[PDB]
Design a protein around this ligand. Structure first.
Ligand SMILES: Nc1ncnc2c1ncn2[C@@H]1O[C@H](COP(=O)(O)OP(=O)(O)O)[C@@H](O)[C@H]1O
Ligand SMILES: Nc1ncnc2c1ncn2[C@@H]1O[C@H](COP(=O)(O)OP(=O)(O)O)[C@@H](O)[C@H]1O
Ligand SMILES: Nc1ncnc2c1ncn2[C@@H]1O[C@H](COP(=O)(O)OP(=O)(O)O)[C@@H](O)[C@H]1O
Ligand SMILES: [Mg+2]
Ligand SMILES: [Mg+2]
Ligand SMILES: [Mg+2]
Lengths: 502, 503, 503
């Protein structure tokens, strides 16, 4: 009774915290943690993963966010909005003594039917792959502050994924470990660019290394270049004053030989995850080797795939077969800093996006906003179909669920219809956020959809219920199915819990 | 946590405040602020970025406005006050459009339109010129509201000269790596005593008294390592079983330092600049050899020196061959003030110079340095861009006039938004005036008309006590600074405008 | 204590706040507020003055804005919300002119110019008419955002009728003393049961059961004194020395009351309305005489009754002659609700009527009364003035359009000031819209153009969901209310604007 009432409310609360960010008239959130760290964003997953939620139900609603984010990438604000709907609706049904088991089944059945509908009303991406995908990329950018440059960012998002996308069984596959995305402040948004290669935010380890190497043999280590001290308690015993220099020379030789090995195998560049001893640094430098250090592991992998290298952790056995390849490696100043660009990679299905923003917190959102597009054009590409956005498909699923409800009649039907009303949350939010009258738009929305206008959504700019695919607001089918999936799974969980104790 | 109206108006209120904190430092008749911490203490400056980096901002939103000064500074050098004041005004002007019902987003879209548009008008009305004559002008203006004395013309000239002495030309365009200009300072009272050294100055003394007071036609060896007794990475112990050996071991040490010095002499090097330490026995023999050595040289410097003299930074003295030694006609220690400093002049590479700043107090030298940097940065930019703008409210007044016209040629809501950006731009003229102590409103009224009649270059003439021809007075704003200021401001203003709930 | 900017912006902030507290009660789609004290308790109203008199305002400046509602109310009856909202907007709009540098005084002079000007345009564009047809219209509109039910047409009609029944004509002009209209209320559920009594109603019962339930062709005596045993001003004591006298003294008392009653009967009076008490023995004989008496009648009433029936209020029953008795065809007690009340109908003087308000709850009757009063006051004014204006943002939109034009024909600073007053006037349309839930900005945009094309009467049409022709809908604002609202607002806005230091 109460545990439930309390849970449902706590949950709905989180939903609302995110509702206002849905769509093109979406608003953003400012989040300041304990440490005073500020995150000003629109990305609902971030807003959620960020906020300080305590109520267990609230944590469960947030569990939704991350999961929707995980599988698809776009639609976490959507998933949350629906989970609140379903919960707020079940709240009504619960008052009429409808058993939470009935509500859970009904919700489950409606959900199933909802995904079917999306498949039905979906549309295979035809030969318009280019402009279709572009239209998708843009709609994504429309909610984010990146809208400012949605045209350029969308082209970049489209270009980047198209590049790393392998069309195998007449079907595409996109490995994101082929798209390196870096953010560097001190440039306008429009300045964001696509760099064929893998940019690493690291400069050469020593003043004397060259600023550019052409036709580079990239040696990738996952071990530091330093003298190896044995595993056993080892001690040097000097009884003759002469031995002192002999020992010191031997230690320098060991390092001078590590460099020799890497060099002997034809390595031109040495990118290591670990540290490079200062003396070893001298040697590489002297050998004319461009070497970076303490590089990010994630980056290490990307350089691997790109250059066809192998991450050697046993320098003594670094073979020529272990060398990556790139047309040229060069240190370039990206504004204030110096970055290392490995261009002309052996594997051309590897590319980088350099997000530019005048300010830290600005470029940070810019980076989040783009990742959202990538995930979209990618998810779309893979799926192969798309659905009309702007609440059209929601209004559609809402429409079809009211029918199915009449078929699978009973108390089940009450739950199925509420599920419909809940899905309608999207059009309401979208309208609300712009300024449109929810109840009026929703009524007109229902009309058109009743009359079989499966693509009539809310053009939040004109306030009219137009053709969403026409005006170009479209989204990958994958986004919609999960949101409804993650959303109903939260509602059902919270809905079975009749007591919460410690 | 604050939602909607509360959050927003509150946010605009925050930005506005931080923005006024620096407002009075704008322009010639600017004032200074005095920030005092807990230990270091008193810092007195006119620099926008400084007054803010040092300022203890608490409110998140205010911290964001501060971010633009740090960016403006590190990215473009001049304009930190402007970008802050402007962000404050765009957020403020928006608060009206907000109350009327206009949606934050469309406002954000108006600012886009507006700024993108202004980003063209200025580039349209920008005035090309790269002659020292105007480079000197950019300088004079960059040093205005700052406490530099009456020497500005002298300082302007040093800057133009330093920039020109390091400006290189590549595939047709001129590049000016400001890193080749080493600026330093030393308390000695003067400001006029600011020397322009055609070389690299190092705030360091020679390590040992008997070392040559000066070295002509110097072969310079830059050393990464410390000329000291090193120990093997694997723990070692020495077991003496014979009393005799106790001395032998003490000698190995000596003979070790002797050889280090020997390697150095063998290379031909007569000047040793060591990034790390130097042992007293090493010093004994470097001196005996007559080599001018300097220890614990700053890596930053080790690098400039490497570049200026053409030397290679070597760690292992075994790879200290004549091939990696740098060149300088003279390496001489000279007492600048209370301090002795090492002067490296006649470097193999001429595109490396210094500006040894003098001035007294201490508090005066630091700021004069800060002023000279703004000047160096903008003169450099201008050297590359070859374009500039009419200073003192001029550019703004024009942009405002044109933008208010472009506004009409735009939709309903967005127009309102762009008219707002037009007004925000007038904040600069108004400010320069206010500080000067003149009448904002009339100044603006008069400035509008003159610019309207086509007088692009009529700015706020503090001398004429009102408006005037900036062309004549030679007040010129570098292009790159205006644009980054405008773009930075719009991006950050938009960021804050969308925040409807702060938690 | 607060000086300058602090004080001012702070003051404008205060006024603005108190002003928004009532903002949502404006117009038809208005809302109500619920004020709760410590004992009496819950008060739910839509009335501007009420929500504020009862509101616990602390800030001085806010107390001043409250003063205008109380004035607007007692001086003109309708418009209390408007005058408050308007003062808030004039102070708010000024805050911009202030920041730009304009001096509070010149702003105060702009508002003078502007208001004086508007005070002419309206009187120029005012629409004359005194027919019941429009008097009824003034009524309907005065009852809008209030919780009166669906009966408004019925209520409007009662009001028009009451006003017309008491409106007198003197040297050519019509006068309507609202004091001749006695409004009362009684919980009984209905609102339609609101009776229009062509006479005076007194919430009082006859003092004694045996008194006539009704009195036809009544000779009414109004009495100032209490029909009770009076004591001599100089302390008295009665010394009984004989047991017999103890009774005699008890009889004097009785015979005293008998005579009081006798004096009353002798005058011809058959109805006695006593402002004070009546003794049980006096009651015995008044009843025995068959006189209808009522005690402790409210002085307010004693006065209306005197005026309605033509009776003279007498204190000394010795001066109770037939000459000072009032007349009424019928004086009858009738049970209205749970309460018994005394109905005095057929008064010698017809220009005296009542409106016995019914409605249920209690909270609903009080407000319906408050609504009926606004209606009574404005219908009355309009009856006298014979002029009116186009309601629902219309008048304002026009004034704003014309005033922005007049602004150009004025100086530099003052223009800015009058353009500010023009915008402040648009606050009403925007408000009506906002509350209705429609789009302020577009509504305004559309409303401007239609009024610009000469459509004076296009107001904010909540029904048409936007703009519309108020002429048709019959939404009319009485003249006197607009003007006092405007004048009150300007005087108080100016007062606050000059305060540069609050201590
Ligand atoms: N141009 C548009 N017109 C109307 N609706 C749009 C438009 N662009 C996006 N939308 C809708 O706004 C919602 C996306 O808003 P967003 O804040 O990005 O949410 P989410 O986190 O779920 O992707 C979707 O339902 C989408 O179809
Ligand atoms: N001599 C001058 N006469 C008029 N305006 C000047 C003069 N010198 C500088 N200004 C103006 O003052 C503004 C910049 O002031 P400044 O203190 O340098 O701040 P910022 O950090 O933004 O460069 C610019 O509009 C500039 O043209
Ligand atoms: N039916 C209506 N249609 C449009 N506007 C109306 C209507 N009725 C009243 N108004 C407007 O609402 C405003 C007054 O609202 P009200 O609640 O009566 O406050 P006030 O105390 O100022 O009279 C006036 O501009 C009036 O013309
Ligand atoms: Mg999205
Ligand atoms: Mg400057
Ligand atoms: Mg009214």
């Amino acid at each position: 009774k109460d545990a439930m009432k309390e849970n449902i409310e706590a949950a709905i609360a989180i939903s609302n915290s995110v509702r206002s960010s849905l769509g093109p008239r979406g608003m953003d959130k400012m989040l300041v943690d304990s440490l005073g760290d500020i995150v000003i964003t629109n990305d609902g997953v971030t807003i959620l993963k960020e906020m300080d939620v305590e109520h267990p139900a609230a944590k469960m609603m947030v569990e939704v966010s991350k999961t929707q984010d995980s599988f698809v990438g776009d639609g976490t604000t959507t998933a949350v909005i629906i989970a609140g709907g379903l919960l707020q609706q079940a709240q009504g049904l619960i008052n009429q003594n409808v058993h939470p088991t009935v509500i859970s089944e009904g919700y489950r059945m409606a959900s199933e039917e909802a995904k079917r509908v999306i498949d039905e009303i979906s549309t295979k991406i035809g030969a318009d792959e280019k402009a279709l995908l572009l239209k998708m990329a843009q709609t994504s950018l429309n909610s984010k502050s990146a809208s400012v440059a949605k045209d350029k960012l969308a082209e970049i998002s489209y270009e980047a994924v198209k590049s790393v996308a392998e069309l195998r069984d007449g079907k595409y596959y996109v490995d994101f470990d082929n798209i390196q995305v870096v953010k560097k402040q001190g440039g306008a948004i429009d300045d964001t660019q696509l760099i064929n290669g893998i940019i690493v935010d690291k400069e050469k380890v020593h003043p004397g290394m060259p600023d550019v190497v052409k036709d580079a043999k990239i040696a990738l280590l996952d071990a530091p270049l330093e003298i190896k001290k044995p595993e056993f308690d080892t001690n040097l015993r000097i009884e003759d004053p002469s031995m002192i220099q002999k020992f010191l020379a031997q230690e320098e030789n060991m390092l001078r030989e590590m460099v020799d090995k890497i060099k002997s195998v034809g390595a031109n560049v040495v990118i290591t995850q670990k540290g490079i001893d200062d003396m070893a640094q001298h040697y590489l430098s002297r050998a004319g080797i461009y070497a970076v250090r303490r590089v990010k592991k994630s980056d290490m992998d990307k350089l691997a795939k790109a250059t066809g290298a192998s991450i050697v952790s046993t320098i003594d056995e670094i073979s020529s077969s272990d060398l990556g390849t790139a047309e040229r490696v060069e240190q370039v100043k990206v504004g204030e800093d110096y970055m290392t660009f490995v261009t002309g990679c052996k594997n051309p299905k590897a590319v980088s996006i350099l997000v530019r923003g005048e300010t830290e917190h600005v470029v940070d959102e810019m980076e989040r906003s783009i990742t959202d597009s990538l995930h979209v054009v990618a998810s779309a590409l893979e799926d192969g179909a798309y659905a009309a956005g702007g609440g059209a498909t929601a209004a559609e699923i809402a429409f079809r669920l009211r029918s199915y409800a009449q078929k699978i009649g009973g108390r089940q039907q009450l739950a199925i219809e509420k599920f419909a009303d809940a899905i309608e949350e999207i059009p309401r939010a979208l309208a609300e956020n712009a300024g449109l009258d929810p109840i009026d738009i929703l009524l007109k929305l229902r009309a058109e959809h009743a009359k079989g206008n499966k693509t009539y959504g809310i053009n939040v700019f004109t306030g009219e219920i137009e053709d969403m695919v026409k005006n170009g607001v479209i989204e990958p089918i994958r986004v919609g199915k999960q949101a409804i999936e993650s959303a109903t799974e939260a509602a059902i969980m919270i809905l079975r819990i009749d007591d919460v104790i410690a | 946590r604050e939602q909607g109206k509360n959050a927003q108006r509150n946010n605009i209120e925050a930005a506005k405040a931080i923005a006024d904190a620096v407002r009075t430092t704008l322009g010639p008749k600017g004032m200074d602020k005095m920030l005092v911490d807990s230990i270091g203490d008193i810092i007195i400056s006119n620099d926008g970025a400084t007054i803010l980096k040092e300022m203890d901002v608490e409110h998140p939103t205010a911290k964001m406005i501060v971010e633009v000064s740090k960016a403006q500074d590190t990215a473009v050098g001049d304009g930190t006050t402007t970008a802050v004041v402007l962000s404050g005004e765009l957020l403020k002007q928006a608060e009206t459009l907000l109350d009327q019902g206009v949606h934050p987003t469309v406002i954000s879209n108006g600012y886009r339109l507006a700024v993108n548009e202004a980003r063209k008008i200025i580039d349209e009305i920008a005035e090309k010129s790269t002659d020292d004559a105007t480079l000197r002008k950019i300088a004079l203006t960059a040093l205005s509201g700052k406490n530099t004395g009456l020497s500005n013309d002298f300082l302007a000239d040093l800057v133009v000269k330093a920039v020109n002495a390091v400006a290189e030309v590549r595939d047709g365009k001129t590049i000016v790596d400001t890193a080749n200009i080493k600026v330093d300072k030393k308390n000695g009272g003067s400001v006029n005593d600011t020397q322009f050294i055609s070389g690299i100055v190092i705030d360091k003394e020679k390590v040992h008294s008997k070392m040559p007071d000066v070295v002509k036609n110097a072969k310079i060896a830059l050393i990464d390592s410390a000329l000291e007794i090193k120990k093997t990475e694997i723990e070692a112990k020495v077991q003496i079983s014979d009393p005799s050996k106790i001395q032998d071991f003490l000698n190995q040490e000596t003979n070790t330092f002797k050889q280090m010095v020997e390697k150095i002499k063998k290379s031909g090097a007569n000047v040793v600049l060591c990034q790390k330490g130097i042992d007293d026995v090493a010093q004994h023999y470097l001196a005996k050899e007559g080599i001018y050595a300097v220890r614990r040289v700053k890596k930053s410097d080790m690098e400039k020196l490497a570049k200026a003299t053409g030397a290679k930074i070597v760690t292992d003295l075994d790879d200290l061959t004549p091939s990696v030694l740098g060149e300088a006609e003279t390496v001489e220690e000279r007492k600048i003030g209370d301090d002795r400093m090492t002067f490296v002049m006649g470097c193999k590479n001429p595109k490396a110079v210094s500006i040894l700043i003098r001035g007294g107090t201490d508090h005066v030298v630091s700021e004069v340095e800060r002023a000279l940097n703004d000047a160096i940065r903008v003169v450099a930019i201008t050297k590359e861009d070859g374009k500039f703008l009419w200073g003192g409210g001029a550019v703004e007044a024009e942009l405002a006039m044109r933008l208010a016209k472009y506004a009409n040629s735009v939709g309903g809501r967005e127009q309102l938004a762009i008219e707002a950006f037009a007004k925000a731009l007038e904040i600069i003229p108004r400010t320069l005036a206010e500080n000067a102590g003149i009448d904002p409103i009339n100044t603006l009224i008069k400035l509008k008309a003159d610019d309207e009649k086509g007088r692009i270059s009529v700015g706020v003439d503090l001398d004429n006590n009102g408006v005037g021809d900036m062309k004549a007075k030679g007040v010129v704003d570098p292009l790159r600074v205006k644009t980054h200021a405008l773009e930075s401001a719009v991006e950050v203003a938009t960021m804050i405008l969308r925040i409807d709930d702060v938690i």
